[PDB]
Design an enzyme around this catalytic site. Structure first.
Site, PDB file in Angstrom:
ATOM      1  N   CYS B  43       0.835  -1.191   0.000  1.00  0.00           N
ATOM      2  CA  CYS B  43       0.000   0.000   0.000  1.00  0.00           C
ATOM      3  C   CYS B  43       0.873   1.245   0.000  1.00  0.00           C
ATOM      4  CB  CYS B  43      -0.948  -0.004   1.204  1.00  0.00           C
ATOM      5  SG  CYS B  43      -1.888   1.506   1.441  1.00  0.00           S
ATOM      6  N   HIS B  44       0.223   2.402  -0.120  1.00  0.00           N
ATOM      7  CA  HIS B  44       0.955   3.657  -0.272  1.00  0.00           C
ATOM      8  C   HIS B  44       1.541   4.136   1.052  1.00  0.00           C
ATOM      9  CE1 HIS B  44       0.937   8.203  -0.477  1.00  0.00           C
ATOM     10  NE2 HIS B  44       1.786   7.889  -1.439  1.00  0.00           N
ATOM     11  N   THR B  45       0.841   3.890   2.160  1.00  0.00           N
ATOM     12  CA  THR B  45       1.341   4.352   3.448  1.00  0.00           C
ATOM     13  C   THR B  45       2.571   3.569   3.887  1.00  0.00           C
ATOM     14  OG1 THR B  45       0.645   5.005   5.669  1.00  0.00           O
ATOM     15  CG2 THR B  45      -0.032   2.865   4.903  1.00  0.00           C
ATOM     16  N   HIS B  65       0.283  -4.186   6.069  1.00  0.00           N
ATOM     17  CA  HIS B  65      -0.954  -4.255   6.836  1.00  0.00           C
ATOM     18  C   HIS B  65      -2.123  -4.801   6.023  1.00  0.00           C
ATOM     19  CE1 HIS B  65      -1.052  -0.403   4.786  1.00  0.00           C
ATOM     20  NE2 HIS B  65      -2.362  -0.380   4.945  1.00  0.00           N
ATOM     21  N   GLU B  66      -1.859  -5.619   5.012  1.00  0.00           N
ATOM     22  CA  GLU B  66      -2.895  -6.187   4.163  1.00  0.00           C
ATOM     23  C   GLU B  66      -2.508  -7.617   3.841  1.00  0.00           C
ATOM     24  OE1 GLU B  66      -2.839  -3.110   1.088  1.00  0.00           O
ATOM     25  OE2 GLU B  66      -5.016  -3.089   1.230  1.00  0.00           O
ATOM     26  N   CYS B  95     -13.174  -4.750  19.985  1.00  0.00           N
ATOM     27  CA  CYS B  95     -13.339  -5.410  21.274  1.00  0.00           C
ATOM     28  C   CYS B  95     -14.810  -5.658  21.583  1.00  0.00           C
ATOM     29  CB  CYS B  95     -12.700  -4.565  22.373  1.00  0.00           C
ATOM     30  SG  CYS B  95     -13.667  -3.121  22.849  1.00  0.00           S
ATOM     31  N   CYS B  98     -15.947  -1.085  24.772  1.00  0.00           N
ATOM     32  CA  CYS B  98     -15.673   0.318  25.041  1.00  0.00           C
ATOM     33  C   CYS B  98     -16.842   1.192  24.593  1.00  0.00           C
ATOM     34  CB  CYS B  98     -14.376   0.746  24.356  1.00  0.00           C
ATOM     35  SG  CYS B  98     -14.383   0.673  22.562  1.00  0.00           S
ATOM     36  N   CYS B 101     -17.415   1.251  20.771  1.00  0.00           N
ATOM     37  CA  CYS B 101     -17.936   0.030  20.168  1.00  0.00           C
ATOM     38  C   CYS B 101     -19.427  -0.160  20.389  1.00  0.00           C
ATOM     39  CB  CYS B 101     -17.187  -1.187  20.710  1.00  0.00           C
ATOM     40  SG  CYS B 101     -15.627  -1.551  19.883  1.00  0.00           S
ATOM     41  N   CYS B 109     -12.337   1.972  17.546  1.00  0.00           N
ATOM     42  CA  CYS B 109     -12.076   1.338  18.829  1.00  0.00           C
ATOM     43  C   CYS B 109     -10.801   1.898  19.443  1.00  0.00           C
ATOM     44  CB  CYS B 109     -11.961  -0.175  18.648  1.00  0.00           C
ATOM     45  SG  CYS B 109     -11.960  -1.142  20.164  1.00  0.00           S
ATOM     46  N   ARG B 113      -4.713   1.162  21.088  1.00  0.00           N
ATOM     47  CA  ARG B 113      -4.036   2.042  20.142  1.00  0.00           C
ATOM     48  C   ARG B 113      -2.750   2.621  20.714  1.00  0.00           C
ATOM     49  NH1 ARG B 113      -4.528   7.582  21.103  1.00  0.00           N
ATOM     50  NH2 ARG B 113      -3.655   7.977  19.025  1.00  0.00           N
ATOM     51  N   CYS B 172      -7.502  -2.657   3.182  1.00  0.00           N
ATOM     52  CA  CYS B 172      -7.335  -1.212   3.265  1.00  0.00           C
ATOM     53  C   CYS B 172      -8.051  -0.441   2.166  1.00  0.00           C
ATOM     54  CB  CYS B 172      -5.842  -0.860   3.257  1.00  0.00           C
ATOM     55  SG  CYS B 172      -5.471   0.857   3.652  1.00  0.00           S
ATOM     56  N   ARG B 367      -2.727  -1.906  -7.790  1.00  0.00           N
ATOM     57  CA  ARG B 367      -2.328  -2.691  -6.632  1.00  0.00           C
ATOM     58  C   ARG B 367      -1.421  -3.826  -7.077  1.00  0.00           C
ATOM     59  NH1 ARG B 367      -3.642   0.912  -3.904  1.00  0.00           N
ATOM     60  NH2 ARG B 367      -4.747   0.846  -1.904  1.00  0.00           N
TER      61      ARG B 367
END
Ligand SMILES: NC(=O)c1ccc[n+]([C@@H]2O[C@H](COP(=O)([O-])OP(=O)(O)OC[C@H]3O[C@@H](n4cnc5c(N)ncnc54)[C@H](O)[C@@H]3O)[C@@H](O)[C@H]2O)c1
Ligand SMILES: NC(=O)c1ccc[n+]([C@@H]2O[C@H](COP(=O)([O-])OP(=O)(O)OC[C@H]3O[C@@H](n4cnc5c(N)ncnc54)[C@H](O)[C@@H]3O)[C@@H](O)[C@H]2O)c1
Ligand SMILES: Cc1cc(C(N)=O)ccc1-n1c(CCC(=O)N2CCSC2=O)ccc1-c1ccc(-n2ccnc2)cc1
Ligand SMILES: Cc1cc(C(N)=O)ccc1-n1c(CCC(=O)N2CCSC2=O)ccc1-c1ccc(-n2ccnc2)cc1
Ligand SMILES: [Zn+2]
Ligand SMILES: [Zn+2]
Ligand SMILES: [Zn+2]
Ligand SMILES: [Zn+2]
Lengths: 373, 373
Positions: B43-45, B65-66, B95, B98, B101, B109, B113, B172, B367
């Site tokens: 991905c780009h990030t 992250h994918e 979760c 919280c 959620c 969520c 974090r 993503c 992609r």
């Protein structure tokens, strides 16, 4: 059906006081209405235009856009209102035919705005003559006069039992605040709201939030003398940015544990608008812009504030559809659901109209009412 | 239940290529899951963090992250997923307890974090050892590896029949575009939409707008080579800002007679964001921000654009509630309701992972999918 001689308060140049003069008012043409103004209210945008800061100001002009009166004459083609009725002029009409009028999401009718912004009737001319000069209209109403001519779509018909000396305030301020609370935001019971500024619009917003059912309301202002009245209208607590060293949005975030649910910005300061956006809750916060800023000012923020949930939105005339909705507001005031008698802070006569502006220059009044008979 | 030796693509400094190395992966602790990654997407990030421009970048680190994989081991206290399952890791957990959620208005969520941003597991440590050093995790997943350890709330369980070599893209990009179209905007049939940028996110947004039922779709970009693919996904017409002397919002206003109904901004340029707000219709327009800007950039506008009707809003992960909503998206892809096979433009092997970044540096691919086995 003949030219009427009356008394008006004409302005001749930017930055000078209004001068009381004698004017001639022409009979209405097709699709027009002549109204005898009974009472009026002095708003903030009137003084803004009089100061001369407006890039679109045109002089000479008769100001005023809040009042109620009684009909005398109607033009050719009018079959809705007859003489003797009690009405309210409106700076947002409702024709009922354009694309903006058939959409339930909006209320910005775009039928006669090109002529309204220039200060002329829809036919293309003005009905006010003074000493051989033509005087333009202001915002389609021009209520600083004993008689005024308006279009047939700018008039709302109310209950004849209403006291015309106080229902006039439902033209610009109270309506805008109440609509911002219960139309553009649509807030559910149990929410937390914050109001920036505590003038007429701020107090109307507080009234609407209390009516709708919010649990906690926070008032923010830099003048302490306002706080008392806010507590009478429903605000639970009031704060002063000068008593804290930290920026105001951090104070609100700490106080409410994350941020408020709704934030209404009712001043006209771009820095306060940014502070109002950054004080809403992450995930589901909303910020409503009600005041109007000076031309050439920009409000800035970072896109990270919008990506994580928050929203800007804005309102003009509280989102009400003017012609069909003002009568309902007058009925609501008849049933004591909303407060109109608690906004008027002063009363003056016509000749002392200038004095009104001075009060607005000092911040000692909410709304002033001028009796024009 | 014992340390696993595997191959990973570690980064050691900002601005240098990734280096393929051998790492040791610890057994999961209580409430953790070990996953063998099968496929991943670049991905780009990821490239943004690798370049070093991110103020929060920490090195050394394993990016990615994918991806989708198969479970091997679960920690103590896991009663939801067993070994052999097909799953998708998620950088937004669920979760379910919280305050974020239990609110249907949001999906952010806020349970883990603080540790996720630091690159550590919820216990406070990392599971990646390389030559006596500790390697941090990236965005809670770290899929540029043959084995990875994630928390138990960051895992979604999908249909075992799904092809894992292409369903990984629902992590993503495609999800974000589809959700922006059908969740944050909620567009009614017959609307007019405009999309800024025509990458993966832009094409996903176009797909969602076509599925929802909009009549007219306009694609805006400064590279002509994209337009063809847009017309295949449902865009009716495409324009180029360099072909017109006037600013782009004026072109759109003239073209659509007033402005578009919805405008999606999918680039990351603050000037394009301002142009996207000013191109929405007066009265009922909406502008949705999907891309992420560099730190320190501000988007500006005048409050007169918000007072007369328009709105900013934003979305992260398309507004989906990740754990309970990704399986529905996989089911939708099974029924051919949405297009996943048309986004993949290249396929590479693990050792050529660096080559992937170069393609992203040239703008020749949508992609790229890396097979990790
Ligand atoms: N969009 C609409 O339809 C509409 C209608 C009516 C009025 N308005 C605008 O709403 C605004 C309010 O007008 P008004 O006459 O009702 O009240 P007002 O303008 O007279 O009161 C302003 C208040 O804001 C406070 N102020 C100044 N700087 C401040 C700061 N940094 N922080 C906190 N407070 C500060 C002032 O002390 C004051 O209490 C005006 O700008 C008006 O033009 C808009
Ligand atoms: N908020 C989220 O959840 C989320 C998720 C994924 C991606 N994103 C962001 O969405 C953005 C798009 O990423 P991508 O990989 O999908 O596609 P991309 O960034 O690779 O494509 C960008 C396109 O915008 C064009 N561009 C550059 N300047 C332009 C200009 N002035 N006018 C018009 N077009 C211009 C480019 O030519 C290009 O076609 C990224 O910034 C990404 O970080 C956000
Ligand atoms: C910019 C403007 C100028 C005039 C004029 N006469 O120069 C009239 C109205 C507006 N304006 C518009 C654009 C025009 C428009 O959308 N519409 C819909 C029907 S007609 C009309 O005016 C959107 C919102 C407003 C507005 C301006 C001032 C106040 N305000 C402040 C204090 N007190 C009143 C309230 C609203
Ligand atoms: C700022 C941020 C940092 C990280 C991190 N690891 O440093 C993770 C997420 C976010 N971020 C938040 C704040 C944190 C937050 O609200 N949430 C909810 C559950 S946990 C979590 O991260 C809101 C939106 C995002 C976000 C950032 C990047 C991308 N993006 C871009 C390209 N590809 C992916 C998508 C969304
Ligand atoms: Zn109309
Ligand atoms: Zn007013
Ligand atoms: Zn949660
Ligand atoms: Zn991504």
């Amino acid at each position: 059906n003949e030219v009427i001689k009356c008394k008006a308060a004409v302005a001749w140049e930017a930055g000078k006081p209004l001068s009381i003069e004698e004017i001639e008012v022409a009979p209405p043409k097709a699709h027009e209405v002549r109204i005898k103004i009974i009472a009026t209210a002095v708003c903030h945008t009137d003084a803004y235009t009089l100061s001369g800061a407006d890039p679109e100001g045109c002089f000479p002009v008769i100001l005023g856009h809040e009042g109620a009166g009684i009909v005398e004459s109607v033009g050719e083609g009018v079959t809705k209102l007859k003489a003797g009725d009690t009405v309210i002029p409106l700076y947002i009409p409702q024709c009922g035919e354009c694309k903006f009028c058939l959409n339930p999401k909006t209320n910005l009718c775009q039928k006669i705005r090109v002529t309204q912004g220039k200060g002329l009737m829809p036919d293309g001319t003005s009905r006010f003559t003074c000493k051989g000069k033509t005087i333009l209209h202001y915002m389609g109403t021009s209520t600083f006069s004993e008689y005024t001519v308006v279009a047939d779509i700018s008039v709302a018909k109310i209950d004849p039992l209403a006291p015309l000396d106080k229902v006039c305030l439902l033209g610009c301020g109270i309506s805008t605040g109440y609509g911002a609370a219960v139309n553009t935001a649509k807030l559910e019971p149990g929410s937390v709201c914050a109001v920036f500024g505590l003038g007429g619009v701020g107090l109307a917003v507080i009234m609407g939030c209390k009516v709708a059912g919010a649990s906690r309301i926070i008032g923010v202002d830099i003048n302490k003398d306002k706080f008392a009245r806010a507590k009478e209208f429903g605000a639970t607590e009031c704060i002063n940015p000068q008593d804290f060293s930290k920026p105001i949005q951090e104070v609100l975030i700490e106080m409410t544990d994350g941020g408020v649910d709704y934030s209404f910005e009712c001043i006209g300061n771009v820095k306060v608008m940014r502070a109002a956006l950054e004080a809403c809750h992450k995930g589901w916060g909303v910020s409503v812009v009600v005041g109007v800023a000076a031309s050439g000012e920009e409000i800035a923020t970072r896109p990270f504030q919008l990506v994580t949930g928050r929203t800007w939105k804005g309102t003009a005339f509280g989102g009400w559809k003017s012609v069909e909705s003002v009568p309902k507001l007058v009925s609501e005031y008849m049933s004591k659901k909303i407060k109109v008698d608690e906004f008027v802070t002063h009363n003056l006569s016509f000749d002392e109209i200038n004095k009104a502006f001075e009060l607005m220059h000092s911040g000692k009044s909410i709304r002033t009412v001028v009796k024009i008979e």
